[PDB]
Design a protein around this ligand. Structure first.
Ligand SMILES: [Zn+2]
Lengths: 99, 93, 121, 72, 107, 177
RNA sequence: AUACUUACCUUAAGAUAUCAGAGGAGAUCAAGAAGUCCUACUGAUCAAACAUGCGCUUCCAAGAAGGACGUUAAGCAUUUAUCAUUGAACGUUCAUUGAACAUUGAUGCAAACUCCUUGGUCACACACACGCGGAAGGCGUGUUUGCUGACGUCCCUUGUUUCAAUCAUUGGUUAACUGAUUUUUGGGGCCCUUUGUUCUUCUGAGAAGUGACACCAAUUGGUGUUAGGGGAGCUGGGGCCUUUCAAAAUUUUGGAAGGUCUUGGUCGGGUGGAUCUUAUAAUUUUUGAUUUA
């Protein structure tokens, strides 16, 4: 997976931002959160072909300013579903989150 | 009585209008006198037939119910007919 | 067009909106309605009239459509040869701005009547 | 309600275009509040000519427009 | 005795409308006018199998991309040919016409 | 019934065609009419745009230039000069070809404004009713003015020049008159 | 402005919530109509405005949306640039006579550049998940009215923001300290397109004012502007908390009062207008001659 930054958080709420990022990057996972911490940050998750597309980058956003790519620190959930137990991992992560 | 649009057509007297007709003919010329029933009389009329030709009438009188629309000049955009709040100076007695 | 037209508004509430009124011919008029009447004679400010040609109509059949626009500006369309009207753009100035503008228009009108009463004296 | 303003055309040779291709030339003998039109010496012009009798009266529904062929 | 009053009992009801052109319209009535200028929010409108004038009148109304989905359509009365009511609605309730009742008591 | 005239701010007690025609041709109506239309245009030209001008957020700004304001009397004076000059530039047309073709055989059918046949019947019909108290036409031929330089015509007028740059002309023309 | 003269014209009708009772019009015939009509009467639904919410929903910065009635551009491909009569030569060509836009176009396919107008280029932050005030609509609650409106408060500032110093006042703790507010000085940033360097006038930020100003025509006539922000007083609404009273089985509901927060403001009429009925389903817009047979 790859996390992109500076991606113009005031574009949309949920799905129109997933359309505007997929349009300027004309993928199976484009996670974008409305929380204040993850604001101008998003995470797309296709892993080796996604690494090739991340190695292809120079990409600017439809609202304007250029987006910086980066590799994901852990994974997306779709990568963990591709590697598939996992439900117990989701339960443990939720139990750490509510803690 | 009239209502706003035919009052506007009563306003744009003697000024260069363009009429489409239902036939597709778009007469153009100075507007001699419109009536309330939208029968409009025109002068120095230049006409476009549906076939694509152009001719010049002097003095036409096109009936209202075959008008497709009429275009008045631009300035009547700013007209006192459109003023929503102009108060009436004590109607007659 | 995501314009989200007022779900309880008719013509008088639609004033100064940018319309897309459609006729019996299939011609479209686009512009600010500034007035209507009982017979649905509209005025249409800065109006542009678009047809499709007979040839482009073939492409319209079950896409990029070379609509032909002439510019009719301030026109005053008739209620006989129309079909239906919709709304295309919201007006320039918002509801607060329209509201304050109407307040100012009414204050100026009352003032002009005071001046008529003064000149009558 | 208002009777039309054909008073200037009262004796002058006018040319109706009737209906979309009918073109009739006469002299305006009369008009009513509906633009029913009494013409004298109607002479229908096809682009061939055909004369239309002494007097004629033409429905103000069918009449599209009329031109003054005579000078005013 | 006019039946437009019948339609005036039908605000916020979901009908279809077939026009004299051949346009078919689906979407709720917000109101109806005296001479049946019916205003309709949440339309999507369709043209059955074709009429070229109706093809133009369909495409040109925006949001065509042949179902055209439109937020708000006023429709003129002399364009409305026929209007299909919902079958859930009971006609025995609506045709009673309190004006016609009062006129029977006025006689 | 009542026909309110929005310009005159008067009424017509019962609308009919003849009082409408007689009112819309009336000189009082035309005067208040013309005042109003001029008035709307001079308002819209006077009215400043005052856009929002959404100011963006931004090293190389090292150069600084001096603005130039004026006095309030100087402001009002230069604005008055510009008003007069706009009013000139809109109104003025170019004569020349009238003064150029003065002697011509068919000047008096073509440029004498209602002998042209095309606009010709207008200016007779557009003539106002002349109820208050107090043309070179087609008759003119070649043999009216046989020899134009016998009876002295005035010369071709000297061309006009911006007074703002009137100081920068060629001093001392060749060939004195 | 006044007088005189002439010309033209003088009234479409009705209603303004709807339904059911209370009472009236206390119904002119031997106890009673039925109905219909009115109402500061009540109850129910509907409509409109205002206020408040909705942990409503959506949209808000080199690019995105829209447009070019611009070009590259004679870019490339295709098609078309009258009829009739007479004569001659082998349907065609030429000549004569009579009758009635434009090829650099038109149509199709795009593509690119340039240009134009709009927008929270907000506040916060630049980070490893799975914020307030804007704009548009929907829903809910409450008030008010059954159409609408016409006719018969004070003070400060208007380049803004932040930091330090000085002084005044007020509170707390033991003359010292801390916090708040106001004034002055200075510096930094942003901005001055405020394009006339700024609600109007004048002067080169200051001064005055809230009928005046600005301006076009010929003192008269016409149009526009008289603003924006902040605070206080007062008032309206919502939310929370406390007290009291009532009802139901410690809890719930309703009313009142106080405190705190947030948002907003500072009777009549032959009158007209708006909406809806009726003339009005017969040639002029709503009771069909625009699915081309
Ligand atoms: Zn007048």
């Amino acid at each position: 997976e790859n996390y992109t930054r500076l991606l113009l958080k005031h574009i949309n709420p949920n799905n129109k931002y997933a359309i505007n990022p997929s349009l300027p990057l004309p993928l199976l996972e484009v996670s974008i959160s409305r929380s204040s911490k993850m604001t101008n940050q998003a995470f797309l998750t296709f892993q080796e072909e996604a690494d090739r597309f991340l190695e292809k980058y120079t990409a600017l956003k439809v609202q304007g300013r250029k987006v910086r790519m980066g590799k994901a620190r852990t994974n997306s959930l779709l990568g963990x579903x591709x590697x598939x137990x996992x439900x117990x991992x989701x339960x443990x992560x939720x139990x750490x989150x509510x803690x | 009585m009239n209502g706003i649009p035919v009052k506007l057509l009563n306003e744009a007297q003697g000024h260069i209008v363009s009429l489409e007709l239902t036939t597709g003919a778009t007469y153009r010329g100075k507007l001699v006198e419109s009536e309330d029933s939208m029968n409009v009389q025109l002068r120095d009329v230049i006409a476009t037939e549906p076939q694509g030709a152009v001719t010049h009438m002097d003095q036409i009188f096109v009936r209202g119910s075959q008008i497709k629309f009429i275009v008045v000049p631009d300035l009547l955009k700013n007209a006192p007919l459109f003023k929503k709040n102009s108060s009436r100076p004590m109607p007659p007695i | 067009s995501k314009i989200q037209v007022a779900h309880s508004s008719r013509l008088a509430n639609l004033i100064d909106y940018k319309l897309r009124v459609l006729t019996q011919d299939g011609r479209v008029y686009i512009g600010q309605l500034m007035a209507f009447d009982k017979h649905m004679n509209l005025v249409l400010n800065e109006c542009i009239e678009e047809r499709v040609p007979k040839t482009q109509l073939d492409k319209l059949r079950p896409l990029n459509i070379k609509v032909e626009k002439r510019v009719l500006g301030l026109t005053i369309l008739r209620g006989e040869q129309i079909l239906s009207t919709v709304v295309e753009d919201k007006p320039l100035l918002s509801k607060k701005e329209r509201l304050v503008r109407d307040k100012k228009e009414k204050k100026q009108a009352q003032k002009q009547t005071k001046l008529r009463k003064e000149k009558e004296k | 309600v208002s009777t039309p303003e054909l008073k200037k055309y009262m004796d002058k040779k006018i040319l109706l275009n009737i209906n979309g291709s009918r073109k009739v030339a006469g002299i305006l003998r009369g008009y009513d509040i509906f633009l029913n039109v009494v013409l004298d010496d109607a002479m229908e012009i096809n682009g061939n000519n055909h004369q239309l009798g002494l007097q004629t009266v033409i429905r103000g529904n069918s009449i599209i427009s009329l031109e003054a062929l005579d000078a005013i | 005795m006019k039946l437009v009053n019948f339609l005036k009992k039908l605000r916020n009801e979901q009908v279809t409308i077939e026009l004299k052109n051949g346009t078919t319209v689906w979407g709720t009535l917000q109101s109806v006018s005296p001479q049946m200028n019916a205003i309709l929010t949440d339309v999507k409108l369709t043209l059955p199998q074709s009429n070229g004038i109706a093809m133009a009148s369909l495409y040109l109304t925006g949001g065509q991309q042949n179902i055209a989905s439109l937020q708000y359509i006023n429709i003129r009365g002399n364009t409305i040919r026929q209007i299909i009511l919902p079958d859930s609605l009971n006609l025995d309730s609506l045709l009673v016409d309190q004006k016609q009742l009062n006129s029977l008591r006025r006689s | 019934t009542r026909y309110y005239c929005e310009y005159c701010h008067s009424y017509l007690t019962h609308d009919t065609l003849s009082v409408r025609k007689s009112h819309l041709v009336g000189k009082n109506h035309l005067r208040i009419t013309a005042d109003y239309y001029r008035n709307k245009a001079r308002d819209i030209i006077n009215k400043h745009n005052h856009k929002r001008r959404h100011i963006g957020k931004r090293s190389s700004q090292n150069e600084t230039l001096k603005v130039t304001c004026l006095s309030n009397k100087e402001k009002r004076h230069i604005m008055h000069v510009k008003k007069m000059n706009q009013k000139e530039l809109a109104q003025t047309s170019i004569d020349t070809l009238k003064l150029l073709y003065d002697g011509s055989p068919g000047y008096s059918k073509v440029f004498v404004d209602a002998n042209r046949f095309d606009i010709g019947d207008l200016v007779k019909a557009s003539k106002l009713p002349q109820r208050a108290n107090e043309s070179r036409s087609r008759d003119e031929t070649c043999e009216s003015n046989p020899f134009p330089r016998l009876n002295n015509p005035k010369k071709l007028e000297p061309p006009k020049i911006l007074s703002q740059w009137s100081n920068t002309i060629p001093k001392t023309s060749i060939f004195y008159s």
